[PDB]
Each structure stands twice: as structure tokens, then as C-alpha cells.
């Protein structure tokens, strides 16, 4: 016959279990991810202690002394919201898709502020092909109407 260690006092953070442990005598704590990379870790605890375990999307299994394993999974929770103003929807996708989010908002911004650069670039490539003959002529009077593509002042 072997003893079973006392129930730990547990409380939950965003992606965490916080556990307060009451060993009567040296007791093994072990835990693993339930995913592809198990990342196993353990320690003998010998006096009262607090642990904070990061709980991944795959879930965490924690086995404390001779007790049966505890199991914990995160669930999609945030202070942000979709359906709000656009800063709130971005803060919402940063809930638990932060790796997706920082990729997709950065590369989306890269193609968007690239495209306005290419649009202004095509407008300048056009403006170069346009005003060329009006520079090359010795009768160099650009028309008062056309002057607006040169951006020249006053309705004179």
C-alpha cells in the first residue's frame, strides 16, 4: 500500500494552471503535452510550493504523486472582440492565433502599401510618357488645362 498525495489547490490563468502543492513527504510531480512534442518534465517537491504550467492547444497532462493524471485544455478566450472597431478585432485574433495573426497582418500590409507605391509609380511612369513632348518642343507653353498634371498653381 502506497499513500496518495493531497488534492492541489488549482486556479486558472490565460493558457496556465497555477497549482499550490501540499507534499507530506518527497513527492514526484510530472507533466507532458498531449501533442506531437511531449516535452516531459518532472521534479521532486519536498515542501509546499506554487507551480505555473503553460497549457498548450493540444492540452497538458499533470500527474502528482500516486494520483491519477489531471488533464487540462485551453479554450478560446480574450478581453478583445470581433464585431467591434477594427483595433478590437485585431486584438481578438491575437487571442490564440498570434502566430497566424502576426504573419497575415504583416504580409497583408506589405502587399497593400506595396500596391499604393506601385500605383503612384505607374502614375509617374504615365506622367513621364505624357509630358515628354511638351518638354521637347521649342514652343514650351504647357496648356493651362494640362498644367494640373504638372501640379502648377493659380486659376490665372
Amino acid at each position: 500500500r502506497v499513500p496518495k498525495a493531497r488534492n492541489p489547490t488549482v486556479t486558472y490563468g490565460k493558457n496556465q494552471v497555477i497549482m499550490l502543492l501540499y507534499p507530506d513527504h518527497p513527492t514526484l510531480l510530472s507533466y507532458r503535452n498531449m501533442g506531437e512534442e511531449p516535452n516531459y518534465q518532472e521534479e521532486w517537491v519536498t515542501h509546499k510550493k506554487e507551480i505555473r504550467l503553460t497549457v498548450p492547444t493540444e492540452g497538458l497532462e499533470v500527474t502528482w504523486g500516486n494520483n491519477e493524471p489531471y488533464k487540462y485544455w485551453p479554450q478560446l478566450s480574450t478581453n478583445g472582440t470581433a464585431h467591434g472597431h477594427p483595433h478590437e478585432i485585431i486584438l481578438y485574433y491575437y487571442e490564440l492565433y498570434p502566430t497566424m495573426t502576426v504573419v497575415v497582418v504583416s504580409v497583408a500590409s506589405f502587399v497593400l502599401l506595396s500596391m499604393v507605391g506601385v500605383a503612384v509609380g505607374m502614375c509617374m511612369c504615365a506622367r513621364r510618357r505624357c509630358i515628354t513632348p511638351y518638354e521637347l518642343t521649342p514652343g514650351a507653353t504647357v496648356p493651362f488645362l494640362l498644367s494640373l498634371i504638372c501640379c502648377i498653381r493659380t486659376a490665372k
Binding site: 512534442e37 511531449p38 516531459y40 487540462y72
Partner: protein, 438 residues
């Protein structure tokens, strides 16, 4: 009628599937894996266990030299020490002080404990899966147990279910495995006859009953001292007794995929890896003609509440009119939404409620309630609780794809920049045209 489908390998989450046979009322199966077992095929290489060293009473030759003698025993050594002058309690055992010799001999042997305290070293080279499955069929819960190697069709309520083979070859076990009293370890143990002192496999034995002991304890006999009668020696301590302290953690505690381990025989269990194909043969007499079933019309769908929890945090209420009293199969046409129900009672001109679960931040889905389909949509809110003791009951989200209504900003900015590009490309094409035509 032959139906084939794929359920994820996750234990303890029930999956729905729709047996849509045209001209007949659709029926919905729910099945849940209660336990998947992978049992590997084991070839025994050897036992390892605590040796004893066997040391006979030493031969002392009074007045002369004893002769060293050679014999085959598992780690044998023998030596002759000279000038040893031993005393027993009442006086000198030899006559004369010198030209006496002591002959010492020793060898190593399996202890009586090797019938009871042995590690067993194996090769584990292919595996033969089994599954225990609960299926809900025509409104009865029924439990069925089957081999999952792709053969073994199991009958239940006159349908036949045939399950597997599983879509991945993965196992926690390496090619080499060792087992102790219900704990099993991946380690590359030394081959038979290659064992080294003070490590796992310092003594080896082809079976738990063979006399073919190999041992390599590096036993050395040492010269006696101070006129004492005894045999002193040095050998490496039992590499098995050391391994019992040095082990680390059993595969039950360290395997991937939430896997569990057992022994007699050895199994991996409940690995959350891959997915399992399953096929149903349903007899033609099990179906009800579409005209003989209930049928539903004039229906509409309303969603009072939607929390994207792990555990049926949404409820949808459906108005309907129905032609007769009877059950109806209820199913989701959208993979992102899972419905807790499977058949509900339908009567009169009335309404019903279904509880559903999703990861969607803005749920849109079609429910099918006995052949008629209804479009259903809602605005979701996140749960407040951070952590729970059960896996997600819904299918995971289509990341970088799905998102929400009120992502309309993606359209309202792409339908901004896309006009700035279109006006830029227009002006460039205009001045390319004036360069020739004007």
C-alpha cells in the same frame, strides 16, 4: 447500402455521419471511439537480472604450492597466492610460517530472484490495432469491440461495421524495448554477448529458463591479508541493481500524443494520432421510404445564444410545420459546427431546439432536419473561463481562411487599394494609347 467515412482518432469525442440514400429518409449515425489499442509483435532477445558471485571455501596448501585449474563457468577466475599464513580461532592452520599457498576461485551465476525480478529485452517490429466503439443507431446506444487492421466486420442490430486500417503507422515503441514489472522503456540495449560491466545487460540469458548465461562483471580476486582465511575480490556491482535506480520515467509518463501504456501483453493506447476510416453496410430493409417518414416545411431558424466554448455553448431554435408525428435526423452541412442532437421528435406546427458547438466567431451554417434544409446564422462571444477538463467537442478552425462578418474591413480596404491600382493602370493605358493615336 454501402457507406464509408473517416473519423478522427480522438478517443471520447462522438462523431456524427449522414447516411444520405436518395428516395429514403436520411438517417444519422453517431459513433465514438471508447479506446484504440496498438499491440506490437515482440521477439525476446534476453533476460537481465541480479547475478550472484559464487565463491567456494578457499583451498590452503600447508607446506607447498597449490596448482591453478581451468574450467568453463560464466565469468570464471582462479588464482594462487603465496606466503599466506592463516590463523583459525585456536591457532595457526598451517604448520610452518612460509611456503604455504592459498588457491582462490570464483564465477558468476543467476540469483534465485531471476524467476521474479528481471528486465526482459525485446525487439518490437510491427503492430496490430483494436478499437472499442460506441455507436448510436436507430435510437439505441450499442457498444462493439473489433480489430482495426481493416478486416473483422462486426455486426450490430443487423448492420455491419468494418473499421480501419488506421491512416498512420506511428507507435511510441522504438525497434528495441525493455520491460520491467509493468513499465516499458525505449533503449538501445547491448546485443547478446556484448554486455559491459556496471551497465544494463552486464549479465544476459536467452530465456528465463536457459543455462546459457553470459556475464562480464570484470571480477578480480585479490590477495588475502593479515593471516585471515577469507577470499577478497573486486567486481562491478550489478548493472541491473543500478538500472532500477537510474531508469528515468516509463513510457506511460513520456510518450507523445497523450498515449498510455500497459503490460501482459504490452500495448500503446488512446494515441491522438491520424484518423480512422470506417465503413457501414446497412441492410436495404433498415431504411424508411421518404413518403412514409415525417417531412418538414415552412421552417426558419433563430439563434438566441452563441458562446464559442468547448462544450455546446450555442443553441438554435427552429420553427417548423410537419406532416406526421415521428423522429427526424438532424445534421450540419458545415464542418465547422457540431450538433449535440442526432434525432429529435417532430410534431404539429411548432418549434424545436438544437444545442450546437463551434470555434466560429460568426456562425453561419445549414442544418438539415429530415431532408429539408434551413440556413442559420449568429454573432458569437468568447468564453470567460480560460481552462477546462475536456477536449474541444467541435472541429478546429480554418485558420487564415474563415474569420467573420465584421471582417468587412478586408473588403473595405482591398476595395479601396484595388481602385487606386485600377485608376493608376487606367491612366498608364490611356497615355500609352495617346502616344500612338494622338
Amino acid at each position: 447500402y454501402e457507406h464509408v467515412t473517416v473519423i478522427p482518432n480522438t478517443v471520447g469525442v462522438p462523431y456524427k455521419t449522414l447516411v444520405n440514400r436518395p428516395g429514403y429518409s436520411p438517417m444519422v449515425l453517431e459513433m465514438e471511439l471508447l479506446s484504440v489499442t496498438l499491440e506490437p509483435t515482440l521477439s525476446l532477445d534476453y533476460i537481465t537480472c541480479e547475478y550472484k558471485t559464487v565463491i567456494p571455501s578457499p583451498y590452503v596448501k600447508c607446506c607447498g604450492t597449490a596448482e591453478c585449474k581451468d574450467k568453463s563457468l560464466p565469468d570464471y577466475s582462479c588464482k594462487v597466492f603465496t606466503g599466506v599464513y592463516p590463523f583459525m580461532w585456536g591457532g595457526a592452520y598451517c604448520f610452518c610460517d612460509t611456503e604455504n599457498t592459498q588457491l582462490s576461485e570464483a564465477h558468476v551465476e543467476k540469483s534465485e530472484s531471476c524467476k521474479t525480478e528481471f528486465a526482459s529485452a525485446y525487439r518490437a517490429h510491427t503492430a496490430s490495432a483494436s478499437a472499442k466503439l460506441r455507436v448510436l443507431y436507430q435510437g439505441n446506444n450499442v457498444t462493439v469491440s473489433a480489430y482495426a487492421n481493416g478486416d473483422h466486420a462486426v455486426t450490430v442490430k443487423d448492420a455491419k461495421f468494418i473499421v480501419g486500417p488506421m491512416s498512420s503507422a506511428w507507435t511510441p515503441f522504438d525497434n528495441k524495448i525493455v520491460v520491467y514489472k509493468g513499465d516499458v522503456y525505449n533503449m538501445d540495449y547491448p546485443p547478446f554477448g556484448a554486455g559491459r560491466p556496471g551497465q544494463f545487460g552486464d549479465i544476459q540469458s536467452r530465456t528465463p529458463e536457459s543455462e546459457d548465461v553470459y556475464a562480464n562483471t570484470q571480477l578480480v580476486l585479490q590477495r588475502p591479508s593479515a593471516g585471515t582465511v577469507h577470499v577478497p575480490y573486486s567486481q562491478a556491482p550489478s548493472g541491473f541493481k543500478y538500472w532500477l535506480k537510474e531508469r528515468g520515467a516509463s513510457l506511460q509518463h513520456t510518450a507523445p500524443f497523450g498515449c498510455q501504456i500497459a503490460t501482459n501483453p504490452v500495448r500503446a493506447m488512446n494515441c491522438a494520432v491520424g484518423n480512422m476510416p470506417i465503413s457501414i453496410d446497412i441492410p436495404d430493409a433498415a431504411f424508411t421510404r421518404v413518403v412514409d417518414a415525417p417531412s418538414l416545411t415552412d421552417m426558419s431558424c433563430e439563434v438566441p445564444a452563441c458562446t464559442h466554448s468547448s462544450d455546446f455553448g450555442g443553441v438554435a431554435i427552429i420553427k417548423y410545420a410537419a406532416s406526421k408525428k415521428g423522429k427526424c435526423a438532424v445534421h450540419s452541412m458545415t464542418n465547422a459546427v457540431t450538433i449535440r442532437e442526432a434525432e429529435i421528435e417532430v410534431e404539429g406546427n411548432s418549434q424545436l431546439q438544437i444545442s450546437f458547438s463551434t470555434a466560429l466567431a460568426s456562425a453561419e451554417f445549414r442544418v438539415q432536419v429530415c431532408s429539408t434544409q434551413v440556413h442559420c446564422a449568429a454573432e458569437c462571444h468568447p468564453p470567460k473561463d480560460h481552462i477546462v477538463n475536456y477536449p474541444a467537442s467541435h472541429t478546429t478552425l480554418g485558420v487564415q481562411d474563415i474569420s467573420v462578418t465584421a471582417m468587412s474591413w478586408v473588403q473595405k480596404i482591398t476595395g479601396g487599394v484595388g481602385l487606386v491600382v485600377a485608376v493608376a493602370a487606367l491612366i498608364l493605358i490611356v497615355v500609352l494609347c495617346v502616344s500612338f493615336s494622338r
